[PDB]
Design an enzyme around this catalytic site. Sequence first.
Site, PDB file in Angstrom:
ATOM      1  N   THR A 290       0.822  -1.245   0.000  1.00 27.73           N
ATOM      2  CA  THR A 290       0.000   0.000   0.000  1.00 27.73           C
ATOM      3  C   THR A 290       0.860   1.302   0.000  1.00 27.73           C
ATOM      4  O   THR A 290       0.658   2.192  -0.816  1.00 27.73           O
ATOM      5  CB  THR A 290      -0.931  -0.009   1.223  1.00 27.73           C
ATOM      6  OG1 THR A 290      -1.762  -1.185   1.167  1.00 27.73           O
ATOM      7  CG2 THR A 290      -1.799   1.241   1.296  1.00 27.73           C
TER       8      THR A 290
HETATM    9 ZN   LIG Z   1      -3.389  -1.193  -0.297  1.00 22.42          ZN
END
Ligand SMILES: [Zn+2]
Length: 383
Positions: A47
Amino acid sequence: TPHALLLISIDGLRADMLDRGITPNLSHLAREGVRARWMAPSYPSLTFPNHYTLVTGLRPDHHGIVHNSMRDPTLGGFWLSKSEAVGDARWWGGEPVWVGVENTGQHAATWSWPGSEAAIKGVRPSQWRHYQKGVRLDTRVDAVRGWLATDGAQRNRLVTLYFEHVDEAGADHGPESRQYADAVRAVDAAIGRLLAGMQRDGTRARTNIIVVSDHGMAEVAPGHAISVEDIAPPQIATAITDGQVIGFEPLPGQQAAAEASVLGAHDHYDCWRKAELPARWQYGSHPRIPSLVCQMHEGWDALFPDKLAKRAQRGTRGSHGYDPALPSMRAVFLAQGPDLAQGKTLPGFDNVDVYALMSRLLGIPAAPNDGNPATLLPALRMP
Ligand SMILES: [Zn+2]
């Protein structure tokens, strides 16, 4: 004329999810606009490294956010909830788009984009916040609505918007689950309300919109979790990260044990000295990367042994962090507005290419980056 740019990330939205009839607002936007078949993440397919790549045009190996969790000999430790690491500009390489926007004397407003809490190259966005779990959909949608409506010298050229909901449901129940589908519908409906709102504010027609995700999601079926200590026991090396990209630092005077037992191919993972990682990953040169990097095969997790005991309940789950060439890791790219083509499809491409498109939509000079500036010229009305 100069037009505003709204940049939206739907964390963990996989590329095939646009074609399941659960994204009526996004589907309509893509049909009116430009859509890639898919967008591949950079390695590692996590992320923080990917949200930062998106706004810099740099591979994680160049921008320095080489994992969600890291160590640096000078700055200490970094993970997602240590706010004073996340908010420290020294972790973050390159120049994200909001810095460029501010350095032109225009204004950027960020709803929780990774890095937007720091003063990167000494420059913050005009509007921002520390990430808070559990903020409501209509809360963030209205804030963004208002930042786009802002007139005068407070006018925002760049507004960013982040949703975690899809990624959280996918982590808990997997990407083929009904919870994953519900989170998708809900974020899609939220974006529909945002667009309707912009129509009522009269801001829609002067606003270019890019919607991306950071990576996709793979299903992790019951029993697909091992301990990091099955890879290398604590007698011989320290596991710096768990999950899917597993970094090890051998113990002093244990090179040979570490390398003889860790390097190479194993049942559900493979490991390399960082300098010898597969060339197409473009990863392993940064000093913050542990000396030994293992990649878990798709649908498998290696966990710290305390987590492994805690979780082991049952339940299909979901993970990202796998080889970015995997179909399961594919992210979304779509775009629409006054300076973007209409009803156009683009080929699959790498996420480092988004930066050059955004620079041009924002009227900023592009900082040096790892992208190809040609890939997304076709998305423009007029290359
Ligand atoms: Zn993510």
